Amino acid sequence: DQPPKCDISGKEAISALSRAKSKHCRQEIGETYCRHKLGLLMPEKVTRFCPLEGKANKNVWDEDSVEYMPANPVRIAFVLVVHGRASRQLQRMFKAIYHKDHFYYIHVDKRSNYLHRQVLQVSRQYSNVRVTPWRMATIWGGASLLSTYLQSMRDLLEMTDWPWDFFINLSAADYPIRTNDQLVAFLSRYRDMNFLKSHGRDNARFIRKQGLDRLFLECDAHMWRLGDRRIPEGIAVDGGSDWFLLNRRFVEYVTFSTDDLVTKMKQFYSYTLLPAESFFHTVLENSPHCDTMVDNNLRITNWNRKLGCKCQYKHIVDWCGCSPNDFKPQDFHRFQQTARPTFFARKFEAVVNQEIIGQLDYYLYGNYPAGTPGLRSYWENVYDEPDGIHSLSDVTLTLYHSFARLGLRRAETSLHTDGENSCRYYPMGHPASVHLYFLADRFQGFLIKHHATNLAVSKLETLETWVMPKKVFKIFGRLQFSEVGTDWDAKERLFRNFGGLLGPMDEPVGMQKWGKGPNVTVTVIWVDPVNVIAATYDILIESTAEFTHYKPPLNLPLRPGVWTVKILHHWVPVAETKFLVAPLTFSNRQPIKPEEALKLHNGPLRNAYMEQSFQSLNPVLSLPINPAQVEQARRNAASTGTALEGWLDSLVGGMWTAMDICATGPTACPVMQTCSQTAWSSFSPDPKSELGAVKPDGRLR
């Protein structure tokens, strides 16, 4: 731990050094700060090459302009920067934008290995699709996103066999809102233009809100704020959206120019938050190409800052940021506007709302044939064996194992015979994959693929089980719904832990959904599995409130079992819901040992969930504490192995239902259907996301 090369006195740098984890990161923080301290890191003045007195703002509107047929159509290089699990939606969007004359270059976040493997299958099928061999961890707001674009531009310019004319960036949450023919016709008419959208406000305020006057450093997948810095003199600084369309001539300039402007701006934006929202605007407006700028990025972005500005990236960057919302069906009319030209839109998420995606795709390229299956369903992989059980948690590993056993028990009881039961199985190994299953924008549960020995013939078989959670919400007031979960998304107003999977060390959150009406106050009560009252509080429901949520401070660990949450109005019952805190069978992915199970499953470290007690409420609410059940709960806390599995599966079976189970290959169970012939399996046909042979018109859709 060597000291720094200079005295470090800035409050922001000392905070970053105290929070940094790796030695390599603390060292790089120190070097950056000390270089900036001596005035050797950032440029102070920059040459402006644009001959214009200010901005250009070229104009582009008649809807009939897009109907002509060009003799020399542009060929487009699409750069897809993607992450997450939504491979089937990316495949659907890729289908909509594909043409054999364009090119597709796909960067997958280093941390998204499952999605990368799925993208490799696409690049292997088509000669005009390639994947970036390098892969960065493009955190939100990171400096690395500009490095990604710049490197991808250099790569594309050196690909001599790909003669492209325009550069377009897209995420897995974008979708087209006009046909490929209309896009090509428009860009063929304006092929010497560049399309970037500016903020549209006071420029001095834009600089401060973006933190452009602050020095940032990306290290350990975090953006550290290290102090202040001056805006360079002599140039106009601008910015806005980091979704754009740039012609090849300007990309060449950015990549290969060695003039004062491009050199110093690449250094400046190496230490900048949200760099792609400002670097390309600032270079273009001050370069010799300034007179090619159109103040329109041809996108509709669904900004709703009342919901999207919650400083939800504070754990990733030393700043507050905002994000666009997902479109919903009521927004479809916004795609048909003709005020200005627009060809893409964001954001779309199939786990949030797929109906609007369907409306848009059929409006552009027509309905699928009658009888096409899976059009209203959605499947999303959330665990894939190649990534290993250590990428799961002890909670999800424990519960995925229990769901699989629940399916094997369904197989056994579904056969009615008086002889040997050829549907008895013994589980083998760990789950092979897990999918989320949605139907008509309603969550249906989990699909678990797993291996098991058919005991009658003594042969291994591969199966998929569908488990669905039991309904537990039970009601002229305003209350519409109530739910307990974790990872609450304040922008989309939903829990991202879709199944509500919880273990004893989780900190649950209670949510309520309200309809319109006069302001009211209600009482919330949390009850643990042996009727111990853990917390109570009132909350004001204002006449405009739509969602309320709160995370009570409950001492850990939580007693395992079925908890209850009650809502009252001046002692009058209103509604209640239930949730499961499951006991764990794994510890660091290993079978849990007695000493570990007893410390984790016997209730909080202290004898109480909060300092304040509520024992006086058990009689008023008719929640007597049974001495017998308390003793048994302590007995359960000490169990392991077989006894613990029976306790867990008893609890899961009371909150989840095994809806069906299928075999992926040959099977000896006579009542088992083949997965490819079901309507729900991840093996069943899903033509809207399937990619086949190129058609005579050069399309896949």
Binding site: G141, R201, K209, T301, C320, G321, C322
Partner: peptide, 11 residues
């Protein structure tokens, strides 16, 4: 319709 820019200030 709305302005662009994802930065929301220091906090």
């Amino acid at each position: 319709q709305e302005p662009e820019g994802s930065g929301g200030g220091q906090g």
